[PDB]
Structure formats: C-alpha cells, structure tokens
C-alpha cells in the first residue's frame, strides 16, 4: 500500500494467530509489543533509557504478518503506550518513506 | 527522494536560515526542534504528558525546507532527545510510507 500520513499510520499485524494493531513508526529503531504470548526462548533487552531503562523479552525471528506480507523479525515482548512496528519490521516489508 | 529506513532517516532541514538535522518520524505528531529562534508570535503547547508534560513554543505557518521542498507548518520549539519531523510536516512534503 501507499499510507499518507494525515492520520497515525496503524496497521493489522497478525502475530501468534493473534490480530492486534500498531503505529508504524520510522522514529522507533524496534518493534514492541504489548500482551501478546510468544513461544520459546528469550533474553532481556533494556530499552527507553530516558529517566531509566525498561526491561522486555526479545524474540528472535518471529514470524509476524503486516498488511498480507509474511515476514520474520525481531519483536520485543513488555510494555509499551501503543504497539509500535519499528525500523527492524519495515525493512523487511520493503517499507520505504517516499516524497 | 525515497528513503529506506535500515538507518535512522536522518535529513537535513532549512529553518530561519539555519541548517539542521532531523528525524522523519512517523510515530510523532508534531514537528519539535531544539535551539532554533523563529520571529514573531507564538503561544505556549502541551506535549508528552507520561510522567508529566512538556511545555514548548508553538509557532504557526513556519516556513522550512526539507531536502529541497520549500513548505509551510506549525514547529515546536522546545527541549527535544533529537530533533523531529513529525506527520504535520511530512503531509506537507507530500512524503508516504510504501511496500
């Protein structure tokens, strides 16, 4: 697709058989999601780090689905203010900022 | 141009005659730089809010150049992590996210 940015650009991810929304957002190096269960291992990852760090859970490789495209990235588990799809996802949907 | 997103979009704005680097956000709303002096008139804005918010000069139809589109928008001047362009400015531009 082309998305125009007049409004936030959230999108359908499927994740874990799981639909959920999130903010594509070319400002966030990561991608972070809020209560979604994620099989296998994991290691800690402090991320923020403005006024402290925020510990979450990164998976490795998982596959997720933004838009009809399958893709496999890193996504990291803990909390955050809204789901975010950050740079790492985009990249590899081929997502490009465009003008 | 079009812009892929395996580094940070870093690009180089044109503001008061001061040139300057800034981020393509499109997790941000608003467009906030830091240490620029914009003429005229302004009033107080809000921004942030999670521990607290923010208060920043908001200045109106400011005129900017970004990677050679000369266009009009609000800027937020204000303390900022990284300077930010944010959706307000890219609509301007006529900038898209595209996969």
């Known amino acids: ?10 999108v359908t991810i499927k994740i874990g058989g799981q639909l959920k929304e999130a903010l594509l957002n070319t400002g966030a190096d990561d ?19 403005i006024g402290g760090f925020v510990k979450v859970r990164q998976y490795d490789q998982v596959p997720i689905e933004i838009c009809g495209h399958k893709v496999i990235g890193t996504v990291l588990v803990g909390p955050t203010p809204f789901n975010v799809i950050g740079r790492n996802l985009m990249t590899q949907i081929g997502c490009t900022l465009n003008f």
């Open 1 to 10: 697709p082309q998305i125009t940015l007049w409004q936030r650009p959230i």
């Open 31 to 49: 991608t972070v999601l809020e209560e979604v269960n994620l099989p296998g291992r994991w290691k800690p990852k402090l991320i923020g780090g």
